[PDB]
Amino acid sequence: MIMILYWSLPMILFILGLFCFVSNRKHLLSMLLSLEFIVLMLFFMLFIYLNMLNYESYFSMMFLTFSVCEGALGLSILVSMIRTHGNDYFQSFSIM
Amino acid sequence: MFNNSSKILFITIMIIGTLITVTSNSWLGAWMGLEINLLSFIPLLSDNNNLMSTEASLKYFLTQVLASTVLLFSSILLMLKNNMNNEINESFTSMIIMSALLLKSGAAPFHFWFPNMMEGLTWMNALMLMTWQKIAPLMLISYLNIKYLLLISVILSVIIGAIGGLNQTSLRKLMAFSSINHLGWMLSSLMISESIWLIYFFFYSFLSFVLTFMFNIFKLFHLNQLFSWFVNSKILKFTLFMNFLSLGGLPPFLGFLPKWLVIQQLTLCNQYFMLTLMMMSTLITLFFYLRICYSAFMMNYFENNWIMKMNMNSINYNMYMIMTFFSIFGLFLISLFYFMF
Amino acid sequence: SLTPFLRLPLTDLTGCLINHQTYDKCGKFEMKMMECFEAYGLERGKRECADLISDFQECVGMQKQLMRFHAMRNERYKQWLKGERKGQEFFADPPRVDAY
Amino acid sequence: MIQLMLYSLIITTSIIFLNMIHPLALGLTLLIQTIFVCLLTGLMTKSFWYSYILFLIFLGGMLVLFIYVTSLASNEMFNLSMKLTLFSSLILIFMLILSFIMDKTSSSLFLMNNDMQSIINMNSYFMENSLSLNKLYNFPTNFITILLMNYLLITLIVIVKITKLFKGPIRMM
Amino acid sequence: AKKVKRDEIEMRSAQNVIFPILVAERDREFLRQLRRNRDEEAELMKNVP
Amino acid sequence: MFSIIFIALLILLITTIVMFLASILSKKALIDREKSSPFECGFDPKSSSRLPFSLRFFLITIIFLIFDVEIALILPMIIIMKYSNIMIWTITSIIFILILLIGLYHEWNQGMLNWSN
Amino acid sequence: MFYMEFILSLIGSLLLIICVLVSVAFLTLLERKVLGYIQIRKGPNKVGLMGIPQPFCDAIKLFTKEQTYPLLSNYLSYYISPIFSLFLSLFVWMCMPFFVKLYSFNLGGLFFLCCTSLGVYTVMVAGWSSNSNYALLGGLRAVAQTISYEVSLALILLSFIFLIGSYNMIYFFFYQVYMWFLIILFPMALVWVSISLAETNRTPFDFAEGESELVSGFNVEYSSGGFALIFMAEYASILFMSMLFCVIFLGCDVFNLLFYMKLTFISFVFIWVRGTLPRFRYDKLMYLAWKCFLSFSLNYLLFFIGFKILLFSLL
Amino acid sequence: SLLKRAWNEIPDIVGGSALALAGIVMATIGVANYYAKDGDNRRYKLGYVVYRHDDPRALKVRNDED
Amino acid sequence: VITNNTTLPEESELNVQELNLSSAALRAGAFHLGKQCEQANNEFMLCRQELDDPRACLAEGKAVTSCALDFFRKVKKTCHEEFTQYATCLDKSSGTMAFSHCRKTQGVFDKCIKDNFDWDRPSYGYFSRAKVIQSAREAPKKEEKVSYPDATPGLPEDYPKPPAKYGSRFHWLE
Numbered sequence A: 001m002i003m004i005l006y007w008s009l010p011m012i013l014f015i016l017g018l019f020c021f022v023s024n025r026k027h028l029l030s031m032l033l034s035l036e037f038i039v040l041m042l043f044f045m046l047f048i049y050l051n052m053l054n055y056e057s058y059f060s061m062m063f064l065t066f067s068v069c070e071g072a073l074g075l076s077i078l079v080s081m082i083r084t085h086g087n088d089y090f091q092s093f094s095i096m
Numbered sequence B: 001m002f003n004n005s006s007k008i009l010f011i012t013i014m015i016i017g018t019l020i021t022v023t024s025n026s027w028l029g030a031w032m033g034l035e036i037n038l039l040s041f042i043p044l045l046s047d048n049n050n051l052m053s054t055e056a057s058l059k060y061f062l063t064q065v066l067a068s069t070v071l072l073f074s075s076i077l078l079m080l081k082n083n084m085n086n087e088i089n090e091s092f093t094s095m096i097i098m099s100a101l102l103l104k105s106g107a108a109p110f111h112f113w114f115p116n117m118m119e120g121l122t123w124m125n126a127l128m129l130m131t132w133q134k135i136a137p138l139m140l141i142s143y144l145n146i147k148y149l150l151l152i153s154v155i156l157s158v159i160i161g162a163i164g165g166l167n168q169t170s171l172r173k174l175m176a177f178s179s180i181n182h183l184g185w186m187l188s189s190l191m192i193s194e195s196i197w198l199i200y201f202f203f204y205s206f207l208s209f210v211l212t213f214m215f216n217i218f219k220l221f222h223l224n225q226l227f228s229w230f231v232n233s234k235i236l237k238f239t240l241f242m243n244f245l246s247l248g249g250l251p252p253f254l255g256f257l258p259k260w261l262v263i264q265q266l267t268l269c270n271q272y273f274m275l276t277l278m279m280m281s282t283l284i285t286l287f288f289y290l291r292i293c294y295s296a297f298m299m300n301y302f303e304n305n306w307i308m309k310m311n312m313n314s315i316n317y318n319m320y321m322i323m324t325f326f327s328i329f330g331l332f333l334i335s336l337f338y339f340m341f
Numbered sequence C: 001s002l003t004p005f006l007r008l009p010l011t012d013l014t015g016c017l018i019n020h021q022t023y024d025k026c027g028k029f030e031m032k033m034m035e036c037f038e039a040y041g042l043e044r045g046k047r048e049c050a051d052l053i054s055d056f057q058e059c060v061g062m063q064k065q066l067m068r069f070h071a072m073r074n075e076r077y078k079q080w081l082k083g084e085r086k087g088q089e090f091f092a093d094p095p096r097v098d099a100y
Numbered sequence D: 001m002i003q004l005m006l007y008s009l010i011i012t013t014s015i016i017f018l019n020m021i022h023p024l025a026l027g028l029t030l031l032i033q034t035i036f037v038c039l040l041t042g043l044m045t046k047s048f049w050y051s052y053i054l055f056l057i058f059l060g061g062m063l064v065l066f067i068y069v070t071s072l073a074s075n076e077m078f079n080l081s082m083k084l085t086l087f088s089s090l091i092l093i094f095m096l097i098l099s100f101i102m103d104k105t106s107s108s109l110f111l112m113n114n115d116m117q118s119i120i121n122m123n124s125y126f127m128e129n130s131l132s133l134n135k136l137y138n139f140p141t142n143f144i145t146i147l148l149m150n151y152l153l154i155t156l157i158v159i160v161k162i163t164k165l166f167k168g169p170i171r172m173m
Numbered sequence E: 001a002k003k004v005k006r007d008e009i010e011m012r013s014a015q016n017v018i019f020p021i022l023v024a025e026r027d028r029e030f031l032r033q034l035r036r037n038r039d040e041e042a043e044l045m046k047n048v049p
Numbered sequence F: 001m002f003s004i005i006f007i008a009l010l011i012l013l014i015t016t017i018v019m020f021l022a023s024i025l026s027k028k029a030l031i032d033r034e035k036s037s038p039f040e041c042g043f044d045p046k047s048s049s050r051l052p053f054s055l056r057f058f059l060i061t062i063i064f065l066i067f068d069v070e071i072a073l074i075l076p077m078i079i080i081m082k083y084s085n086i087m088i089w090t091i092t093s094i095i096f097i098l099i100l101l102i103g104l105y106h107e108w109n110q111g112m113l114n115w116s117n
Numbered sequence G: 001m002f003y004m005e006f007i008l009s010l011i012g013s014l015l016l017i018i019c020v021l022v023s024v025a026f027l028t029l030l031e032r033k034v035l036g037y038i039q040i041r042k043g044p045n046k047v048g049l050m051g052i053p054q055p056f057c058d059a060i061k062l063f064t065k066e067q068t069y070p071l072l073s074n075y076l077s078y079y080i081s082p083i084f085s086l087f088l089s090l091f092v093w094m095c096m097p098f099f100v101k102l103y104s105f106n107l108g109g110l111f112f113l114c115c116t117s118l119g120v121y122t123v124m125v126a127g128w129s130s131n132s133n134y135a136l137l138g139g140l141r142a143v144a145q146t147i148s149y150e151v152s153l154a155l156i157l158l159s160f161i162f163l164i165g166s167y168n169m170i171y172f173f174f175y176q177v178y179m180w181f182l183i184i185l186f187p188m189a190l191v192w193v194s195i196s197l198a199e200t201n202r203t204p205f206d207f208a209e210g211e212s213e214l215v216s217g218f219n220v221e222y223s224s225g226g227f228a229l230i231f232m233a234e235y236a237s238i239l240f241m242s243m244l245f246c247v248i249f250l251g252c253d254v255f256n257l258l259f260y261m262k263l264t265f266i267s268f269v270f271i272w273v274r275g276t277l278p279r280f281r282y283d284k285l286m287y288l289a290w291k292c293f294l295s296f297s298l299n300y301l302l303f304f305i306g307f308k309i310l311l312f313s314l315l
Numbered sequence H: 001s002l003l004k005r006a007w008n009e010i011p012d013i014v015g016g017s018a019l020a021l022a023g024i025v026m027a028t029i030g031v032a033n034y035y036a037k038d039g040d041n042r043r044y045k046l047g048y049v050v051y052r053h054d055d056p057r058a059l060k061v062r063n064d065e066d
Numbered sequence I: 001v002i003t004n005n006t007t008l009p010e011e012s013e014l015n016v017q018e019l020n021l022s023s024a025a026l027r028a029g030a031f032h033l034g035k036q037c038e039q040a041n042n043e044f045m046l047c048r049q050e051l052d053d054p055r056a057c058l059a060e061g062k063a064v065t066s067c068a069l070d071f072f073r074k075v076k077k078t079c080h081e082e083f084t085q086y087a088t089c090l091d092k093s094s095g096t097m098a099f100s101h102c103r104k105t106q107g108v109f110d111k112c113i114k115d116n117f118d119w120d121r122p123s124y125g126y127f128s129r130a131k132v133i134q135s136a137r138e139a140p141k142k143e144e145k146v147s148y149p150d151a152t153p154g155l156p157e158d159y160p161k162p163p164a165k166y167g168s169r170f171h172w173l174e
């Protein structure tokens, strides 16, 4: 099928990104590491679709701007994490 | 909008973010508005005086980031096969979009994060989360037309939303499970129309807007505090708590009219079996509301006696009393409303 | 394309985000189709736009042609692996570079 | 041809990335992949302008998280996994073998490279990225860029307020 | 800036005298190829259902 | 590209050979428990280097991520000046650089650009 | 024909590689002689004939000297970091404009930005891999350098780019045919050299090495093989960045001989400055980039956006 | 005063903003001058542009000398 | 997409004498060549834009190539030596085949062609301008508007709106 010969690989890569975002690693940063991994794969598919259009790749910039802000915001929340808990370990948070 | 000029901004940018989503004529445009909305809420939500608040700022962020990420994943996939923002005949690719949106709003199967982040929010924060943040997600689900997936969330929402709430004593955590149930009614109202949903949402926000103030004005966070709460006229305290009954949708009060119009339309559309599970499950929701009214309906209590006085903010209380008055006598104004016909 | 319920002035902001109307092989194909959606509305348009949607999708998505192409290649390989072809004459003469 | 080998490597590096635990091991895996994805994207496009931008953008994020990794997760451990090295090396050669015996006219992506375009296409004889990036700064889509600007500036107000610089440095107490 | 533009326009003007020539050539060979492909398709798949 | 990748590999091979010569050409002597000890001015070290190293430019560190992503939006300017509407291009570009300056001066005046103190 | 074409491209890169690798050896001698004459010293004068074979006389030692295997270092990372430091130094040369084509490189200006940023990881990884207190301080002193110069670097490149119309470096030749952009861009030339120093981590911005603050910075735990490549990779950066100053502000007549008389002179300037200025203070640089340079660079984008617009109307 | 303090403390932002202010001014001259010449209609066109004698655009052909 | 019923011209018709003349040789005569075959070029290029069917412009294309081949026969007859020197220079002077380098040899040719055929080199920007012609094809594309008589009708503003019968008609007329 068309979807299997052309769009399978990025999707299989995407789900592997999510399975990193949920696996049990001690440090919160392990979530941030896997966060921009997924974003890297989202860019890849979005770039497939935008190129089916002849001239629409400019929207890649729009996507990248929101990619950094969620990473940048994701990093700020970690900073605020440290200065109330002292450490970023997942097991240090109240389970609720 | 409580402390500094900065809080004023984040509130507005939240409004802009939500509006961009619900006014967008394409999935990609809609997704952008969600990102705008995301960072407008977190700074409002994070305060370092509380060890709990920063934890709340986390669980929301990880959940919402995943939701928008998976949401964008499917939207790209959706128009990779159809080449349109719309799918002619709904299929799996459209289901995936629905799953993300439900998690974005904390519907039943993916609600877990939602109560578990309510421990560390101020009351004014919970209102923004409970009411406004549910606009953009639920409003996009109106575009998608999958029945069984949406139908399953309703059945689980009313059930999990009710049974879970019986065991809580923290009002903030209790209202979360209460809000999950009202969310179930919306999604049921969303497979039939939107004008009902728009009406029903406005009333739901109205009641929650009221109950939040009463706790917010008197800083109550636990059931025991209700019994210890001091009021000059036990008649006054008795009447303030009569808003819970409206939140329970009892017909003598305004809070039933929303439930009522959702049944006159679901029944018109032959969804009889759904209403049985929903309306029946609402009783359990009505139950723990009465557990709160134990502190009002009985009206002579053993209370601590180092308080003789009520210290309350005027403007909040001034607006709260006005809102409460309609919440008890708002039924006879159904004549005026012309949005149901 | 989706229809916002709100349709406040904000929709003007993001309306023209992604389109096919800028120098595209399918610019005319989509304008007809989407026009027909505007004439009949969205829900009824999905039942009157059978040709326009299929043509537009076969102009952008191109699945209909790519999925012809593999049938030719696979059927070329199937013949050879069955011995029906030969190694010397496996492919036809290539096109000229200065073409297409 | 290298496109298929790029497919193999991006798959291979993703398998191991699922198994990294040490944050820097994750980072090295991610950095390597950011190279390949950047390379791969430019194959199926009229220019590599976006690969340059994407590469530049992520490298900014690469440095910053090392600074925080070296402050938060400084003391952690690696473990060479003989299961992993064999598994990746086993499939990697296996995948590389296929790419040599693949009908790699069929595997090529249908997206039109610049040369894949016709000779008659008059719009393909301008500067490499003129038209594509054009309407990023023309009516009406320009307002989207403007909307980002506030969004980025408003973000810049969010970090300082979340961060609360004055109440000290950051240490992994 | 004038001199660079002067030179550029001269280079571009040379294209417009050559560009029509190539298009004439390509069409007369683009068409010829299409016949061969329409004929290769016939032979390749005689026995397909 | 494909030319550059080949030379990229060829260079990497060449530079790799250089130490592979150095590793053999290097004089070889028995390694001592002290020869491989770290250098910290001749006195044994108190603290591993893998302890948490405090940070003071964390705030700038985040601002650096942002400011780059606006470099993605100024760079295309030149390329599309001959091809764009001059009012839209002129107006938008200016209100792009004013926004950046205003943001910078705002934080500079608020003292966020200064390090943690 | 075409098959032959890429063969020549290989030869050019190899020819450019060996020539650059040789020059950085002789640059190090030049650094010692010139820095030995600004100081009233004589400089290397004995070895061989008049000191010319001095740098070769040192390349012998740094390779007949044993590798160091630090006890507490992740050896594989510690062992590989020198390779990529040298590779990235040589690799960035493939974009240097030639009228006798070597590589097309439309968007060559960006390719500069990508490659130069990569040079920080090699320092960064080497310092952390060494697992010594000083080495780590050197690495994190280098990263903070990037946070400063990186953003201002792009903006200042953008100003030059507006003048030429494209990111292809070849166009610098045509526009610098009557005069030199140095005249139009005098403060940027002066600023650009300042940022160029940060790129190569030189005095007054010598923080990665950090000599006399850190014992030897991130190099403190390297020896014969690894340290040599770190050194060569350092001076390859100077040589290129000096050339990149000659193509931007000084004519860019790559095929003329004088261009190489100019190239060495800017190399002399880099040594000249090292013998004049004391090192900045680790924070004063980061404040300098954000407080002054970034604001400065943005101000002229308006000046050149207006000037290009005004010039566009006339032409 | 104010002018003095900045001119003494941060002279670059004053000089830099002085040229920045120059950009806006002579950008406002050039942009107005551009539509004072009808520069949208450019005598040299990218690509091979051919009009019919009856097309409305055929009237607006900018007639120049070289 | 091509099927049997789609009509492509037979192979013999597409055959026609071709230039087969390298790039540098073409760029040499560009300015003098352009002034001659402009009538054919514009006629050919005009149809190709309005009408995007390659087989439709088949007749015009043969005119364009014939004019090009016609021009070089003249050059072959007279300035053969000069043209080769100009082309050789233009080819071997830079990697772009820019005119800015070979101005000298160019002059030699321009004087040969203006002494043998009294032609003039057009100004540098002559061919970059918009070229308006008298369409000999005489079939400018038509204009039409689609018609949907079955469109979803709406309530027209002229429609009168009397009071509702018994009002809301809800439950107890409220």
Ligand SMILES: COC1=C(OC)C(=O)C(C/C=C(\C)CC/C=C(\C)CC/C=C(\C)CC/C=C(\C)CC/C=C(\C)CC/C=C(/C)CC/C=C(\C)CC/C=C(\C)CCC=C(C)C)=C(C)C1=O
Pocket (backbone or CB within 6 Å): G021, G022, G024, G025, G028, G029, G032, G055, G056, G058, G059, G060, G062, G211, G228, G231, G232
């Ligand atoms: C007392 O107060 C003072 C201080 O306080 C302590 C100071 O710190 C200082 C500090 C001084 C400085 C920082 C000065 C700058 C110097 C340094 C940072 C380091 C010192 C080293 C140098 C100057 C030497 C420069 C060169 C290197 C380090 C090596 C670089 C690599 C090189 C040259 C190899 C290049 C590669 C090539 C292929 C070139 C061609 C061929 C060869 C080399 C091959 C050689 C031989 C063979 C292959 C053998 C073949 C044989 C056969 C076939 C038979 C001063 C001055 C001071 O006064």
